Amino acid sequence: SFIARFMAFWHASKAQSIIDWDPSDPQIISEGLYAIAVVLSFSRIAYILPANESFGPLQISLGRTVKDIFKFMVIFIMVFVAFMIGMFNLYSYYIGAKQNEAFTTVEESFKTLFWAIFGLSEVKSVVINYNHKFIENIGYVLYGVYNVTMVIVLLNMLIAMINSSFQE
Amino acid sequence: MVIFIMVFVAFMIGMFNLYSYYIGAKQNEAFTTVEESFKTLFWAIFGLSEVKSVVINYNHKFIENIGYVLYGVYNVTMVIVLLNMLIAMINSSFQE
């Protein structure tokens, strides 16, 4: 980030030195990465957290639960990709039809299909401004069965198996 | 709740620091002032926040994507990890 800000300072300093909203401009790259560095540096306090009594066992169990949920994240993203390639493959020709955006490009459909895990996606994403009611229904069934299968099965897997991990 | 608000502040200062120059750009409000961004970042725990909060009326697609990744990773990490921590550890507290 500081490299980027120094580059911007050198270009601009050469500019206003000569006298006497750029899309790719490096300064927005500096403000961009500087935020991620803020998040990481704020999240580096877990090194000095464990020293205290009541916070130690908490910090210790966190890592165990994360190590437990990784191997579920594997099958999670397997199902995610399995549905996402199907949906992108289904709606790829409709780019100028459906009301709301996405479900069109790969990177743009990955979004609406990722935010359905948290319930922030809209169902109205599946409607089409043509008629073609068969493809619309196929979208409703694929999206719904995605939600049911992956969310409802994988959540109960996570909870039941993590309680299984504590009891032993 | 201690570590909960630690992560909350850790993401909130990053997001406020990211969008602070865009005050006249993004469609929907907040993610701008400290007290105003704390709101949309608090209501994401309950799912009442909108994803459309991350879009920008300029182009600058890099900063928009950084917002999507920071907000998403916030949601995943803090909600999905801290909930399973709460339930698993509270059942651990009952059984003993």
Binding site: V38, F42, R44, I45 | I13, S20
Partner: peptide
């Protein structure tokens, strides 16, 4: 060394917040 190191980390965070505010 622990209280000093940790404290200086906290003033690093503080300078981050005050750099962000204005």
């Amino acid at each position: 060394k622990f209280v000093a190191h940790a404290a200086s980390f906290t003033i690093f965070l503080g300078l981050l917040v005050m750099n962000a505010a204005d």
